[PDB]
């Protein structure tokens, strides 16, 4: 109850740093990187009971995940990886781990001031994506 209150809402991407390099490290191909990197998605976060839903709506590829914290699920990513995901809350940060093909990437979502800051890590490469309220 009230676990993700400050995440709930509709958010719009306003800045990105190092996302191309993050995608390269993940293994995303050229054409997907170029088109995906243009997108300015809206991220829509909602909670109903124990179920959290995160939607991403963009000109590249709409996605939607629903999950319970700590409970692994199947996810098809925007770049079409078939991953096994687990999302937990760690000290007020949503921590999303994706596993596929013996690889792993972690996406952290945090509230900072009036922004939602998304940090994506693959090995030594980090990308920071900043969202504001839509």
Instruction: Report the interface residues with ligand N1I, using CB under 6 A.
Output: 13, 23, 26, 28, 32, 36, 43, 56, 77-79, 107, 118, 120, 129
> Is 129 labelled a binding residue?
yes
| d(C-alpha 51, C-alpha 30), whole Å | 35
> Is 131 labelled a binding residue?
yes
Least spacing, CB of residue 1 vs ligand N1I, in Å: 26
Least spacing, CB of residue 8 vs ligand N1I, in Å: 16
Q: Which residues, 6+ apart, have CB-to-CB distance to 40 below 8 Å? A: 12, 13, 14, 58, 59
Q: What's the DSSP call for residue 72?
A: -
| d(C-alpha 96, C-alpha 122), whole Å | 12
CB-closest chain residue to ligand N1I: 36
Least spacing, CB of residue 58 vs ligand N1I, in Å: 9
Q: State which residue, 89 or 119, has the beta carbon closest to ligand N1I.
A: 119
| Binding-site residue set for a fatty acid | 129-131
């Amino acid at each position: 109850s009230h676990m993700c209150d400050a995440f709930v809402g509709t958010w719009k991407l306003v800045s990105s740093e190092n996302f191309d390099d993050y995608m390269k490290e993940v293994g995303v191909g050229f054409a997907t990187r170029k088109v995906a990197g243009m997108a300015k998605p809206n991220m829509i976060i909602s909670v109903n009971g124990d179920v959290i839903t995160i939607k991403s709506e963009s000109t590249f590829k709409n996605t939607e995940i629903s999950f319970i914290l700590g409970q692994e699920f199947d996810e098809v990513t925007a770049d079409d990886r078939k991953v096994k995901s687990t999302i937990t809350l760690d000290g007020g940060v949503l921590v999303h781990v994706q596993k596929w093909d013996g690889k792993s990437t972690t996406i952290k979502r945090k509230r900072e001031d009036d922004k939602l800051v998304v940090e994506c890590v693959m090995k030594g490469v980090t990308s920071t994506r900043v969202y504001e309220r839509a």
